[PDB]
């Protein structure tokens, strides 16, 4: 009936004023792509940057179990896009937001799915 909860712990540490995690891996590209959230090769536009996937996942970097029936990871082996004004804390950005399941953009930073 007992178990550890690391996702609540980084949030409390940040609100009190600690420094975020460093050494994530950034790539060279043209900046004329399509703008979707998770892809098989780099796809950033004129308002974003692109990064390697395993180095931005909280469970991979701390050495712990993935929270799943079949411990399956969504990022290892692909590439992820981040907006330029938020690029100082990539680990925290992915924990807090959600992806739209019909057009593929981030909810709140790209999905226009309502007339």
């Amino acid at each position: 009936a007992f178990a550890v909860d690391a996702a609540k712990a980084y949030k409390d540490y940040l609100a009190s004023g600690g420094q975020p995690i460093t050494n994530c891996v950034k790539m060279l590209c043209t900046h004329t792509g399509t703008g979707q959230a998770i892809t098989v090769t780099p796809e950033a536009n004129m308002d974003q940057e692109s990064f390697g996937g395993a180095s931005c996942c909280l469970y991979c970097r701390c050495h712990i179990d993935h929270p799943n029936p079949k411990g399956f990871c969504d990022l290892k082996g692909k590439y992820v896009q981040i907006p330029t004004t938020c690029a100082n804390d990539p680990v925290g950005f992915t924990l807090r937001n959600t992806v739209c399941t019909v057009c593929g953009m981030w909810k709140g930073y790209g999905c226009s799915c309502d007339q």
């Binding site: 891996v25 043209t30 970097r61």
Partner: protein, 298 residues
């Protein structure tokens, strides 16, 4: 003149034909650093300039390709060179990597330990290495030929590389071996290459193109390393970042080369002709399996 707009510089043919004696290396700009774009690491820029130069040679590229990579971990716990190679190759290629201390990675599969404990059942189409031993720094006598991990690498090549494939392996002033220069004489062409972003160091990569399985030419290995030090001592090179700003033609091309199985005593002059021009591979085509040995004590 036009050199500052290329990705690097290669060793000219008339320096390979002389007979010199060995001396000490003394570079005019020995301690200088270059100016990089706003958020980028030195190890991501170095691997991007090496793949731009390999695009100008006659490599073979089949359906369902196979690649392996030694010495891949950093002193901070991640793998930047493995992530540039996966951006370059065609979608669906299989890739495996390895090192002595622990790390985390984007490849299909990973193994941890000393290089002499690794074994495999099949054969491979391309091979890459960045290994280096720390106690080479502690210099106390004349400069002679070295052993260690260099003895494992010469034997893996003669036993598990397919007829028609290629390689690239790294060296410096004090880290080198005499029987590896002698084996460059069993390919169809060869050279040594220096990147424009680390031009104030004595590092280089040694490269062999399309493999044949027996000697074409005879080479003495002690004499050919002394010819390499004479070129660097009389020809200085100037640091530059220009080619990182244009990426519109980076990815490798899709030729669909053919694959067969054959037995010794069906190798014609016809057959050798096709291997040399970059258009045939010879091996088996079953399925892939690997492992590592463990010692038990106390």
């Amino acid at each position: 003149s036009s050199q500052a707009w290329q990705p690097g510089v290669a060793m000219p043919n008339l320096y390979k034909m002389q007979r010199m004696l060995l001396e000490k290396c003394d570079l005019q700009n020995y301690g200088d650093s270059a100016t990089l774009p706003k958020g980028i690491m030195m190890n991501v820029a170095k691997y991007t300039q090496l793949c731009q130069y390999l695009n100008t040679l006659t490599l073979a590229v089949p359906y369902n390709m196979r690649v392996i990579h030694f010495g891949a971990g950093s002193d901070k716990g991640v793998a930047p060179g493995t992530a540039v190679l996966r951006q370059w190759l065609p979608t669906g290629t299989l890739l495996v990597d390895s090192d002595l201390n622990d790390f985390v990675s984007d490849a299909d599969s990973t193994l941890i330990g000393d290089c002499a404990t690794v074994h495999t059942a099949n054969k491979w189409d391309l091979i890459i290495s960045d290994m280096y031993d720390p106690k080479t720094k502690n210099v106390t006598k004349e400069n002679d030929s070295k052993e260690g991990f260099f003895t494992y690498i010469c034997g893996f090549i003669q036993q598990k590389l397919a007829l028609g494939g290629s390689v690239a392996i790294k060296i410096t002033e004090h880290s080198w071996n005499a029987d590896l220069y002698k084996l460059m004489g069993h390919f169809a062409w060869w050279t040594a290459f220096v990147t424009n972003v680390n031009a104030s160091s004595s590092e280089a990569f040694l490269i062999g193109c399309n493999y044949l399985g027996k000697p074409r030419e005879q080479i003495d290995g002690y004499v050919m390393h002394a010819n390499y030090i004479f070129w660097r001592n009389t020809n200085p090179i100037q640091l530059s970042s220009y080619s990182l700003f244009d990426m519109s033609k980076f990815p490798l091309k899709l030729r669909g080369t053919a694959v067969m199985s054959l037995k010794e005593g069906q190798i014609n002059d016809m057959i050798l002709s096709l291997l040399s021009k970059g258009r045939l591979i010879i091996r088996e085509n079953n399925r892939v399996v690997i492992s590592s040995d463990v010692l038990v004590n106390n």
